[PDB]
């Protein structure tokens, strides 16, 4: 209904798409720290164990 | 006395009407501008109603 305008309707749009970037970048830092096969394979041993 | 006073406040306020009628030739230049920038985008509705009040 126009009851704001349309520039701090982009603004805000903007902020909403940075801060989904923000969780995105955190959310493929949390996707790491379990860390998934690069490739389907055989895989060896840990040459590192738990704990170190 | 009472013809002086008349030709007196009639002079000034046809002076008062000129002034008024410059208020509204500005006024109507800042609602025009207004309209302008409410078609754009930058201003909202609530600016345009303001101006137009």
Known sequence: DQAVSKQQYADAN???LQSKAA???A?????????LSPISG????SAV???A | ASV???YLTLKADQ???QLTKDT??????SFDLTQRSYDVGVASALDLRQAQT
């Open chain 1, 27 to 35: 959310r493929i830092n949390l996707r790491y720290t379990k860390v």
């Open chain 1, 23 to 25: 969780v995105e970048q």
């Open chain 1, 49 to 51: 164990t738990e704990g």
């Open chain 1, 14 to 16: 903007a902020a909403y």
């Open chain 2, 15 to 17: 002076a008062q009407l």
């Open chain 2, 4 to 6: 002086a006073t008349a």
């Open chain 2, 24 to 29: 509204l030739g500005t006024y109507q230049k």
């Open chain 1, 42 to 45: 055989r895989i060896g041993r």
